[PDB]
Amino acid sequence: KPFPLPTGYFGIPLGLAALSLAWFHLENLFPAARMVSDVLGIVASAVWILFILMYAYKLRYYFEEVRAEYHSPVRFSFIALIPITTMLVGDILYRWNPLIAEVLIWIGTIGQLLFSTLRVSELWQGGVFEQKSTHPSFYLPAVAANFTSASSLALLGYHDLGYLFFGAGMIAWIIFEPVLLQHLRISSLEPQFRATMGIVLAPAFVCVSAYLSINHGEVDTLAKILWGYGFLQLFFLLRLFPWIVEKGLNIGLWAFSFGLASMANSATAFYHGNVLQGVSIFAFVFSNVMIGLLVLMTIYKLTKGQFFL
Amino acid sequence: KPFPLPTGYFGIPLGLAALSLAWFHLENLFPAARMVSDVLGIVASAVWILFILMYAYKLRYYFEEVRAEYHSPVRFSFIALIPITTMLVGDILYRWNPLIAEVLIWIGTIGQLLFSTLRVSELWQGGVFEQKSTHPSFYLPAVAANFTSASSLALLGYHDLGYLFFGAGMIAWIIFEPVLLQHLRISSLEPQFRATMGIVLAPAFVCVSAYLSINHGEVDTLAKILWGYGFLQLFFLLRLFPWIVEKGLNIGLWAFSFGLASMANSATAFYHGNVLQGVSIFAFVFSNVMIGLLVLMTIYKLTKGQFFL
Amino acid sequence: KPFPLPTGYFGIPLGLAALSLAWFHLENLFPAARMVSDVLGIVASAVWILFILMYAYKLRYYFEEVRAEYHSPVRFSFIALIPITTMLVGDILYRWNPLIAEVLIWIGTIGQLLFSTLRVSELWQGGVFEQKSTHPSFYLPAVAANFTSASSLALLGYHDLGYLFFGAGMIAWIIFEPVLLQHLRISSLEPQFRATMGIVLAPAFVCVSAYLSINHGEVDTLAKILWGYGFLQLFFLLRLFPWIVEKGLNIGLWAFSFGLASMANSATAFYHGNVLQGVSIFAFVFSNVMIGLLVLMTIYKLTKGQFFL
Ligand SMILES: CCCCCCCCO[C@@H]1O[C@H](CO)[C@@H](O)[C@H](O)[C@H]1O
Ligand SMILES: CCCCCCCCO[C@@H]1O[C@H](CO)[C@@H](O)[C@H](O)[C@H]1O
Ligand SMILES: CCCCCCCCO[C@@H]1O[C@H](CO)[C@@H](O)[C@H](O)[C@H]1O
Ligand SMILES: CCCCCCCCO[C@@H]1O[C@H](CO)[C@@H](O)[C@H](O)[C@H]1O
Ligand SMILES: CCCCCCCCO[C@@H]1O[C@H](CO)[C@@H](O)[C@H](O)[C@H]1O
Ligand SMILES: CCCCCCCCO[C@@H]1O[C@H](CO)[C@@H](O)[C@H](O)[C@H]1O
Ligand SMILES: CCCCCCCCO[C@@H]1O[C@H](CO)[C@@H](O)[C@H](O)[C@H]1O
Ligand SMILES: CCCCCCCCO[C@@H]1O[C@H](CO)[C@@H](O)[C@H](O)[C@H]1O
Ligand SMILES: CCCCCCCCO[C@@H]1O[C@H](CO)[C@@H](O)[C@H](O)[C@H]1O
Ligand SMILES: CCCCCCCCO[C@@H]1O[C@H](CO)[C@@H](O)[C@H](O)[C@H]1O
Ligand SMILES: CCCCCCCCO[C@@H]1O[C@H](CO)[C@@H](O)[C@H](O)[C@H]1O
Ligand SMILES: CCCCCCCCO[C@@H]1O[C@H](CO)[C@@H](O)[C@H](O)[C@H]1O
Structure with a gap:
């Protein structure tokens, strides 16, 4: 029974792929991490292939649904999950086949940049985006995609180009967040x-x-500054969690997986650098437990026919 | 005749304590600074003890007034003055008794972090905070408290944890200020x-x-960048001063003391580092004159029964 | 036939002067750049003298028009073009006469700082500036003027004072842009x-x-970060260009020249530093072609009596 794949589902392979990469970065300290990384990376890649095929089906047979999501000043952002996950799968595959990895990384980089250049900029024409369009999802095309390009290009050896993408993401982040948090303060985000x-x-x-x-992997003043604000936001979101799930636990909670996996990844570097190793261990374990809970809730939802639309 | 202590009064020991610390940092250049620092530190600590006792009285006998201030999306911020001043008094007392200092510093750090995690985050639920709630006082829990933790933890030797608090404050600052200044531009802040x-x-x-x-104390590019924006804001506020006091000089002007004392403190480091020593001298003298004027106006107000509620 | 000079016309010598300085910085790599720099610098200086004389005429004989522009919460910003261009002409003239350069640089620096301190701060009184006043022109007094002071004072040897102006501009930029881009998203900027x-x-x-x-000229992590966001914005504006010129090509397009010239200038430093030299060459050539097109369109407009009011 055909259905149009909800684009947000790409957050699942995204979180798993990012978590694979975190474990990869533990390999030099703890060799057993290699197997955990490889298993997560294969599962993420397989889910990504499936979802890419489903989205190709959506494009072929449900094109007007894609067009409507693209032109929406809110829903367009989830499309950025496609190139983001493509790059992360490339990053995973690099351990086995750098040529294929490089192809995926460049496709995702050119794709995300084309996507933002076409759609993010178009918002500045005014009159379509509304105050109520000011949602966390906007971070995906505006911020996350650039960071992912930055790290993926660095993996391939392009460190200076990587810094260009990094800067685009970092400054875009601090330029958007102020208005997002003010909006959230004034207007209650609907449960959905x-x-x-x-x-x-x-x-x-x-x-x-x-x-x-x-x-x-040099843990410097900037890195420590970033971690501090990161933990502040973690604490805030932990306090907000009962409100977030007021209307029940749902699959949308995979939204947290990107930040959780990145907290695990950055923890490996702090640990390697002998900076706040206790915090690093806590962060790494915490992120893995939470993503583990997402996986278990997702298997549960699947073993009952409550996964796809 | 019992009264509920207005929470904002903690700005008085705050400004005096911060100024004690500024003078402390002049000791290695000018030994006479020690006595000035110690006198300011004892006066700040004594006023802090008094106000802590008064606030304990407020909690015991005027609890609903505290509850209302806590739940207000505007007035809650002044509560952060309590842990901020507690940490600064700890920093002062460190010169005489590091054990007691460490206790106060940790109480104020855990206290401020718990406070923001409970209340600052709760604003993001929406519908309580309004555009008109966008006030400078929000810097206290969001920004100042984290910087104070950062410097206090550094004093105790926890430099990496200090950088985490520093980053939380710095990024929180640049995330809030944009919407504050836009709000001030559009809506005239009421004289009160x-x-x-x-x-x-x-x-x-x-x-x-x-x-x-x-x-x-390394005066680097970041430090110089910060000082520049600091002075820009000083100039702006000097130009705005007649509007600020349109309806008369009042005790609320202690609000300026934190920034003034911190400008004095940072001046000592610029001077030590042989960076802009002339500017440093001007800044240090200017800040002390202005706080001196606050003290004299406050003694005046006291010698007439116009201090407490 | 007397007319009041539209203040925005100072953007012409501004763009040309900035471009002269870009070519100046190529001299050590390519000696022929010297002549191109000198020709652009003489033309910019001559146009600046003419426009200064015209504005002096405006002040003498059309003072109420100046007063109205000054008090406008939107139009005041263009006045900042006067001290900005004065400093850039000083920077040009430094190659021939440092004494005269220093006079112009200090006049423009004191002038811009006085101007912002009087007018930018006054906006914070509220009730005059409106949401609809949130225009890109605000970058001129708030941001561009400080950067220009920073670079001009550095030329004269005042590197630490230069960093103060730099910081004031950089932080002012990130404090304004968030609310500008949100405003543009919600409200369509009128064609005019x-x-x-x-x-x-x-x-x-x-x-x-x-x-x-x-x-x-040290091309470091900060420089690379800035370039990345710069190029993001370039791409966005290229995509937006047909909307920008919906109602036709006009002389207002000189607005782009400052950023274009600065992209050329920064390209020379990236190239000197052997960072992204290919990107540097593209950027330098692109910026010169675009400004060349502005010059040709302006000569065209002049050879038809469609230049001044
Ligand atoms: C994976 C992303 C796919 C998004 C595709 C939607 C593209 C825009 O779709 C349409 O194309 C036509 C022009 O070519 C025009 O009608 C419109 O601007 C637009 O509706
Ligand atoms: C996400 C990975 C690649 C994204 C490709 C997006 C294709 C969009 O396509 C474009 O969308 C524009 C709207 O802004 C339309 O106006 C264009 O004519 C259409 O070509
Ligand atoms: C939005 C927040 C940005 C903060 C930027 C932090 C500035 C980085 O800081 C710099 O880091 C170096 C590396 O450790 C130090 O040696 C420098 O002295 C330090 O200033
Ligand atoms: C990124 C965070 C994950 C790193 C997990 C490390 C767990 C190991 O634990 C640590 O092992 C050390 C030696 O190997 C011991 O010295 C430590 O005392 C112990 O805490
Ligand atoms: C110094 C700071 C003191 C602030 C105390 C106010 C705390 C909240 O006070 C109340 O407590 C009850 C739950 O325990 C609930 O009614 C409410 O959420 C709240 O009204
Ligand atoms: C300022 C120094 C310590 C601060 C302690 C604050 C105590 C707050 O108390 C809490 O406030 C919450 C509201 O956000 C309530 O909902 C909680 O149930 C209540 O426990
Ligand atoms: C919000 C504003 C943040 C600006 C961050 C400034 C970046 C710091 O700058 C860095 O400082 C070091 C120390 O002096 C230098 O050596 C680096 O080369 C310099 O880029
Ligand atoms: C933080 C700013 C306060 C420092 C105040 C310093 C005042 C001393 O003044 C300075 O003393 C020097 C030697 O000690 C002399 O060389 C200087 O010429 C003189 O200006
Ligand atoms: C190049 C910049 C010139 C701007 C000049 C306009 C200055 C303000 O002009 C007027 O001056 C009077 C006070 O002196 C008062 O009426 C007003 O505040 C103001 O209208
Ligand atoms: C742009 C180069 C120098 C600028 C000088 C600006 C002169 C402004 O002049 C001032 O404007 C104020 C308004 O904010 C008025 O209230 C003042 O009384 C008037 O002196
Ligand atoms: C608003 C964005 C500000 C970002 C500030 C970037 C921090 C600068 O970064 C610092 O630059 C130095 C010079 O290359 C490095 O050695 C430091 O290790 C690096 O952190
Ligand atoms: C700021 C960007 C402008 C610099 C333009 C440089 C153009 C020269 O071009 C370069 O010249 C080199 C030697 O001089 C050759 O090695 C290069 O292969 C060639 O690309």
Whole structure:
């Protein structure tokens, strides 16, 4: 029974892929991390292939649904999950086949940049985006995609180009967040969108993870500054969690996985650098437990026919 | 005749304590600064003890008044003055008794973080905070408290944890200020709140003072950048001063003391580092004259029964 | 036939002067750049003298028109073009006469700082500036003027004072842009103002150019971060260009020249530093072609009596 794949489902392979990469970065300290990384990376890649095929089906047979999501000043953002996940799968595959990895990384980089250049800029024409369009999902095309390009290009050796993407993401983040948080303060995000509060966890941690990927894992003043704001936001979101899930636990909670996985990834670098190793251990374990709970809730939802539309 | 202590009065020991610390940092250049520092520190500590006892009385006998201030999306911020001043008094007392200092510093740090995690985040639920709630006082829990933790923890030797608090404050500052200044441009702050424009002086100077405390007094590019924006804001506030006091000079002007004291503190580090020593001298003298005028106006108000509620 | 000079016309000598300085910075790599720099610098200086004389005439004989522009919460910003161009002409003239250069640089620096301190701060009184006043032109007094002071003072040897102005501009930029872009998203900028979207190109490139001028041309992490966001904005504005010129090509397009010239200037430093030399060459050529097109369209407009009011 055909259905149009909800684009947000790409957050699942995104979170798993990012978590694979976190474990990969533990390999030199703890060799057993290699197997955990490889298993997460294969599962993420397989889910990504499936969802890419489903989205190709959506494009072929439900094109007007894609067109409507693209032109929406809110829903367009989830499309950025496609190139973001494509790059992360490339990053995973690099351990086995750098040529294929490089192809995926460049496709995702050119894709995300074309996407933002076409759609993010178009918002500045005014009159379509409304105050109520000011949602955490906007971080995906505006911020997360650039950080992912930055870290992926660094992996391929393009450190200076990586810094360009890094800067685009970092400054875009601090330029958007002020108006997002003011909007949230004034207007209550409706329950149907609240799981996307998890995306608010992502910026600082995705930022510092990308930064450390480009700067050879040097845990410097900037990295520590970023981690601090990251943890502030974590604490805030923990306090907000009962409100986030007021209307029940749902699959949208995968929104938190990107920030959680990036907190795990950045923890490996802090630990390697002998900076706040206790905090690093807590962060790494915490993020893995939470993503583990997402996986278990997702298997549960699947073993009952409550997964796809 | 019992009364509920207005929470804002903690700005008095706050400003005096911060100024004690500024003079403390002049000791190695000018030994006579020691006595001035110690006198300011004892006076600040004594006033703090008195106000803590008064607030304990408020909690015991005027609890509903505290509850109302806590739940207000505007008035809650002044409560952050309590842990901020507790930490600064700890910092003062460190010169005489590090054990007692450490207790006060940790109580104020855990207290402020718990306070923001409970209340600052709760605003993001929407519908309580309004555009008109966008006031300079929000810098206290969001920004100043984190900088104070950063510098206090650095004093105790916890430089990396200090950088985490520093980053939380710095990024929180740049995330809030944009919407504050836009709000002020559009909506005239009512005279009763205008003295709190003095808090707008604080961020850059409290930021750079905390930064220099953590980075061993190294006056680097970041420090100079911060000072520049700090002085811009000083100039702006000087030009605005007749509007700020349109309806008369009042005790609320202690709002300026935190930024003034932090400008004095940071001046000592610039001077030590042989950076802009002339500017440093001007800044240090200017801040002391202005706080001196606050003290004289406050003694005046007291010698007439116009101090407490 | 007397007329009041539209203040925005100062953008012409501004763009040409900035471009002269870009070519000046190519001299050590390519000696022929000297002549191109000198020709652009003489033309910019001559146009600046003419426009200064015209504005002096405006002040003498059309003072109420100046007063109205000054008090406008939108139109005041263009006045900042006067001290900005004065400083850039000083920077040009430094190659021939440092004494005269120093006079112009200090006049423009004191002038711009006095101007912002009087007018930018006055906006914070509220009730005059409206949401609809949130225009790209605000970058001129708030941001561009400080960067120009920073680079001009560095030229004269005042590197630490230069960093103060730099910081004031950089932090002012990130404090304003968030609310500008949110405003543009919600409200369509009217065609008559759209050419000023070109000013949105300026911040990152003017910032990095000023930074590199102060830090001895060291292309570091900050510089690369700035360039990245700069290019993001360039791409966005390229995509937006047909909307910008919906109602036709007009002389207001000189708004883009400051950012274009600064992109050329910063390219020379990236090239010198052997960072992204290919990107540097593209940027330098692109900016010169676009400004060349502005010059040709302007000569065209002049050879038909469609230049002044
Ligand atoms: C994965 C992303 C796919 C998004 C595709 C939607 C593209 C825009 O779709 C349409 O194309 C036509 C022009 O070519 C025009 O009608 C419109 O501008 C637009 O509706
Ligand atoms: C997400 C990975 C690649 C994204 C490709 C997006 C294709 C969009 O397509 C474009 O959308 C524009 C709207 O802004 C339309 O006006 C264009 O004519 C259409 O070509
Ligand atoms: C939005 C927040 C941005 C903060 C930027 C932090 C500035 C980085 O700080 C710099 O880091 C270096 C590396 O450790 C130090 O040596 C420098 O002295 C320090 O200033
Ligand atoms: C990124 C965070 C994950 C790193 C997990 C490390 C867990 C190991 O634990 C640590 O092992 C050390 C030696 O190997 C011991 O010295 C430590 O005392 C112990 O805490
Ligand atoms: C110094 C700071 C003191 C602030 C105390 C006010 C705390 C909240 O007070 C109340 O407590 C009850 C739950 O425990 C609930 O009614 C409410 O959420 C709240 O009204
Ligand atoms: C300022 C120094 C310590 C602050 C302690 C604050 C105690 C707050 O108390 C809490 O406030 C919440 C509201 O956000 C209530 O809902 C909680 O149930 C109540 O426990
Ligand atoms: C919000 C504003 C943040 C600006 C961050 C400034 C970046 C710091 O700058 C860095 O400082 C070091 C120390 O002096 C230098 O060596 C670096 O080369 C310089 O880029
Ligand atoms: C933080 C700013 C306060 C520092 C105040 C310093 C006042 C001393 O003044 C300075 O003393 C020097 C030697 O000690 C002399 O060389 C200087 O010429 C003189 O200006
Ligand atoms: C190049 C910049 C010139 C701007 C000049 C306009 C200055 C303000 O002009 C007027 O001056 C009078 C006070 O002196 C008062 O009426 C007003 O505040 C103001 O209208
Ligand atoms: C742009 C180069 C120099 C600028 C000088 C500006 C002169 C402004 O002049 C002033 O404007 C104020 C308004 O904010 C008025 O209230 C003042 O009384 C008037 O002196
Ligand atoms: C608003 C965005 C501000 C970002 C500030 C970037 C921080 C600068 O970064 C610092 O630059 C130095 C010079 O290359 C490095 O050595 C430091 O290790 C690096 O952190
Ligand atoms: C700021 C950007 C402008 C610099 C333009 C440089 C153009 C020269 O071009 C370059 O010249 C080099 C040697 O001089 C050759 O090695 C290069 O291959 C060639 O690309």
